[PDB]
Design a protein around this ligand. Sequence first.
Ligand SMILES: [Mg+2]
Ligand SMILES: [Mg+2]
Length: 133
Amino acid sequence: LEELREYQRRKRTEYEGYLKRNRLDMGQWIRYAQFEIEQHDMRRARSIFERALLVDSSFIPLWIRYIDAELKVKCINHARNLMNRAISTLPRVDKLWYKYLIVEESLNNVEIVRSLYTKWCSLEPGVNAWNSF
RNA sequence: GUUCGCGAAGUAACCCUUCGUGGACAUUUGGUCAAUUUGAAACAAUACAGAGAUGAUCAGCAGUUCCCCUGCAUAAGGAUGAACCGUUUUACAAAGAGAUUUA
Ligand SMILES: [Mg+2]
Ligand SMILES: [Mg+2]
């Protein structure tokens, strides 16, 4: 376990030291947020992504990946509540809607998307958006 | 304890002493804290590692950090004060070609 313990500890010194110095460079956050996922600890990883939304919330690769780590282990109402916060923050975006729509397809629930497209049409988005509805 | 008044005692031209009493005067200090080993000074010495760039030797001045130290300091010094120079794979598709493959 010390063959493990000191591994995890030494990594969390190196990653934080760099992020300590560079608030930006999201490339590091996602990497380091991925490290804590592969240790099967969701609490730490969620903190990291939540810590990395403060730095920039306009960076969609970060938003998208933090949907993955929720969906991969199948924590539903988190990746569900998250999408409340996700598309209310950046309501214009394209990718964020479709990744919320297409993930609702594989959940087979068409009542959701019925009300989804209600709002997403209420927002008057544009051509390619309406055509999906 | 002082003073006012009263009530008694011995002496008493009513006063001095003595006793018993009513009232007034005066009215809530200090602790965030307990006296040596177990609620946290530091330095020196010893051993190990050695003080930026670059072919090599050097002057430095800044920036960034959930590092500080000497200094009256918003001056200036402290190795250019220190620490940092590592790691990096997905908003991701469009066209075509081969093969497997089912109503
Ligand atoms: Mg310096
Ligand atoms: Mg200096």
